[PDB]
C-alpha cells in the first residue's frame, strides 16, 4: 500500500509535468490574433489532453 | 526588315525593377527613332504612350536651357544619338538629386558613366574596357541578374545594419563602464586587454553570426533606402542609449558587490571602497587587511563575466530590430546559436587554462558567483524587450 | 602608398596613439608581470598590421 | 587608453569583409561578379537603373 500510494504521489507529479511542458509546446499561439484561436477554442484543447 | 532585338528576361527585369521602385533609363549611341521603339518593346515605354517630352536625343538635351536638364533627367527614359560625354553627364544630373545611380553597359563608350555611376555594371560578353570600369559583371548577360544582385545588396545591409548596431552598442556600454569607475573613485574594473578580447572574439563571431541572419520576404516590395538613413536614431538611440548605461553599471556594479557583499573579500560597506588609493599609504587608516585586495582579479572576472554574458544576450536581441524573441525565436539563426557557444566555450578557457588567466588577468568564479552574473545580465533581455514593445505600440511601429 | 593609405583613418590612428601610450606605460610597470605587461601594445598592433 | 579601446570597435572591420566576401561568394552563384566589395551595399540602395 505504501509502494502504491508513493506510485500515485509521484504519478501527479509527473502528470502536472507534462500539463505544463504541452503548455511549452504552443507557445507561439500568442502570434495569431485570427479568430481561429479564440481564449475559449483553445482552452478546451488542453482540457481535452489533461 | 531586321532590327537588333532585345533580350528575351529584359522586358520581365524591367517590370521587377520597377516593384522595387527603381527606376531604368535607357541611354544609347543608336538614333531615336529605335531607341523609344525598343523602349516600347520592353516596357520602359506604353504601347501608345506619348514621348515627346521622355525622350531626347543628346544635342536636343543639351539644348534645353541648364535648368530643365536636370528636371528632363527626372523625368525622361530615353536618350538616342548620344556621345559618351552624354551618358556620364546624364549619371552626373541623377547623382545632383542625392540618387544612388547605376550604369549598365558593354561598349567602351559607356566606360566614363560605368565610371561616375555609384554601381558600374558590364555584360559578360561585353569589352574588356566596360568590364575594367565596373563594380560588378554580369556573367551571363541577363538583366535579371542585376534584379538578384539587388536583392541580396538589401538583404546584406539590413544584416550589416545589425551587427553593427550590436558591436557598437557594446562599445557604449564598455566606455559607461570606464567612466563610471572612474569619477566613482572604484578600481580597475576592467583592463583594456578584456576589452579587446570581447571586441574581437566575444562579440567577434556574434557579429559575423549576425551577417547570415534570415532576409526579410518583402525586401524587393519595398522602395529603395534613403542613402542619408542614419543606422541609430530615435527611440533606438534613446534605447542603446539605456542598454548602455545598464552594461555600464552591470559590470561596474558586479565589481563592486564582490569587493563588499561577496563571501570572499568582505569591505567598506560604506562605500569606502572609493579611497582604495590611500591603503599602502595610510594602512592604519580604515583598511586592516593587504592592500593588494583591489588589485584581486576575482571582482575584474566577475565584471567581464557580465559583459560577456549581456553581450550574448544583446546578440539574440539583435536578430531583429523591433520583434521580440517570442516573435522571432532565437533558434531562427543557427549560426548564431553556435556562435553564442563558441564564444562562451572560449571565455571558460580563457580562465582555466592557466598559461591565459594569468595573462588577462582574471580568476575562474564558482557556482555561486555565475548565479550571480546570471541575476544582472539575464534581465537585460527583458530590459529591451520591454522598450521593443514600446515602438510597435506607443510608436508607429 | 597603399599601406600609407591605410592609417589614414580616425579611429585607426587614435587605436595607434593608444598603442604607443600603451608602450610607453608599459615600460614602467614591477618585474613580478612584465612577460604579461606587453600584451596589450603588441595585440593593439598586430590588428592594425592585419 | 582604456577610453579609447572601450569606445573604438575593433572588429567591426573585420566582420564587414569577411561578411562582404562570403556574400560576394554567393552573389558570384548568382552570375554576379563583384570587382568592387563596397559596391554590394550601394547596389541594393541604387534607385535608378
Ligand atoms: C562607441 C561608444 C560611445 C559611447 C560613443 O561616444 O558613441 C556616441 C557616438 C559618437 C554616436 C552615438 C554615441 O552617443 C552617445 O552615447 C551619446 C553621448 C553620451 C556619451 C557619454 C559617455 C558616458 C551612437 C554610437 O550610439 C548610441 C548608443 O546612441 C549612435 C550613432 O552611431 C551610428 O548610427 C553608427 C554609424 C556607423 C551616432 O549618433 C554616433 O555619432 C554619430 O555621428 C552617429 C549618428 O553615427
Ligand atoms: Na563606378
Not at chain 1, 509521484?10 to 481561429?36: E, M, R, T, Y
Not at chain 2, 534584379?147 to 562599445?171: D, P, T, W
Not at chain 2, 558587490?257 to 567598506?268: I, L, N, Q, R
Not at chain 3, 589614414?8 to 596613439?17: A, G, K, T, Y
Request: proline share 5%.
Amino acid at each position: 500500500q505504501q509502494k502504491l500510494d508513493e506510485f500515485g504521489e509521484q504519478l501527479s507529479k509527473v502528470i502536472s509535468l507534462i500539463c505544463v511542458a504541452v503548455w511549452l509546446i504552443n507557445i507561439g499561439h500568442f502570434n495569431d490574433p485570427v479568430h481561429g484561436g479564440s481564449w475559449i477554442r483553445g482552452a478546451i484543447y488542453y482540457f481535452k489532453i489533461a | 526588315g531586321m532590327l537588333d532585338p532585345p533580350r528575351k528576361e529584359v522586358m520581365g527585369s524591367i517590370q521587377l525593377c520597377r516593384d522595387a521602385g527603381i527606376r531604368v533609363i535607357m541611354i544609347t549611341g543608336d538614333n531615336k527613332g529605335t531607341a523609344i521603339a525598343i523602349c516600347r518593346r520592353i516596357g520602359i515605354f506604353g504601347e501608345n504612350e506619348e514621348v515627346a517630352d521622355r525622350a531626347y536625343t543628346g544635342r536636343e538635351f543639351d539644348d534645353l536651357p541648364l535648368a530643365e536638364q536636370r528636371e528632363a533627367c527626372r523625368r525622361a527614359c530615353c536618350f538616342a544619338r548620344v556621345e559618351p560625354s552624354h551618358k556620364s553627364k546624364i549619371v552626373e544630373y541623377l547623382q545632383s538629386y542625392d540618387e544612388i545611380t547605376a550604369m549598365t553597359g558593354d561598349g567602351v563608350n559607356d566606360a566614363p558613366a560605368l565610371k561616375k555611376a555609384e554601381i558600374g555594371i558590364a555584360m559578360g560578353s561585353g569589352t574588356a574596357v566596360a568590364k575594367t570600369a565596373s563594380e560588378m559583371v554580369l556573367a551571363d548577360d541577363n538583366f535579371s541578374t542585376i534584379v538578384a544582385a539587388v536583392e541580396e545588396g538589401r538583404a546584406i545591409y539590413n544584416n550589416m545594419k545589425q551587427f553593427i548596431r550590436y558591436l557598437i552598442s557594446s562599445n557604449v556600454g564598455e566606455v559607461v563602464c570606464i567612466f563610471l569607475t572612474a569619477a566613482l573613485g572604484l578600481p580597475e574594473a576592467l583592463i583594456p586587454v578584456q576589452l579587446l578580447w570581447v571586441n574581437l572574439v566575444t562579440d567577434g563571431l556574434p557579429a559575423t553570426a549576425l551577417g547570415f541572419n534570415p532576409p526579410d520576404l518583402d525586401i524587393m516590395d519595398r522602395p529603395p533606402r534613403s542613402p542619408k538613413e542614419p543606422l541609430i536614431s530615435g527611440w533606438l538611440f534613446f534605447r542603446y542609449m539605456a542598454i548602455g548605461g545598464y552594461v555600464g553599471a552591470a559590470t561596474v556594479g558586479a565589481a563592486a558587490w564582490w569587493f563588499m557583499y561577496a563571501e570572499d573579500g568582505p569591505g567598506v560597506t560604506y562605500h569606502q571602497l572609493t579611497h582604495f588609493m590611500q591603503c599602502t599609504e595610510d594602512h592604519p587608516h580604515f583598511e586592516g587587511l593587504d592592500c593588494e585586495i583591489f588589485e584581486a582579479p576575482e571582482p575584474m572576472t566577475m565584471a567581464l563575466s557580465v559583459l560577456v554574458t549581456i553581450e550574448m544576450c544583446n546578440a539574440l536581441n539583435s536578430l531583429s530590430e523591433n520583434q521580440s524573441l517570442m516573435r522571432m525565436p532565437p533558434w531562427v539563426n543557427i549560426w548564431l546559436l553556435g556562435s553564442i557557444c563558441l564564444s562562451m566555450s572560449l571565455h571558460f578557457l580563457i580562465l582555466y587554462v592557466d598559461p591565459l588567466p594569468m595573462i588577462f588577468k582574471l580568476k575562474a568564479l564558482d557556482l555561486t558567483q555565475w548565479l550571480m552574473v546570471l541575476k544582472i545580465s539575464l534581465p537585460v533581455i527583458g530590459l529591451d524587450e520591454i522598450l521593443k514593445f514600446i515602438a510597435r505600440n506607443y510608436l508607429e511601429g | 602608398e597603399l599601406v600609407i593609405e591605410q592609417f589614414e583613418d580616425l579611429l585607426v590612428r587614435i587605436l595607434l596613439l593608444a598603442a604607443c601610450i600603451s608602450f610607453v606605460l608599459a615600460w614602467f610597470e614591477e618585474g613580478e608581470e612584465t612577460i604579461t605587461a606587453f600584451v596589450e601594445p603588441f595585440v593593439i598592433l598586430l590588428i592594425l598590421i592585419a | 587608453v582604456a577610453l579609447a579601446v572601450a569606445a573604438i570597435p575593433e572588429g567591426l572591420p573585420a566582420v564587414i569583409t569577411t561578411c562582404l566576401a562570403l556574400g560576394t561568394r554567393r552573389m558570384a552563384k548568382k552570375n554576379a561578379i563583384v570587382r568592387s566589395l563596397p559596391s554590394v551595399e550601394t547596389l541594393g540602395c541604387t534607385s535608378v537603373i
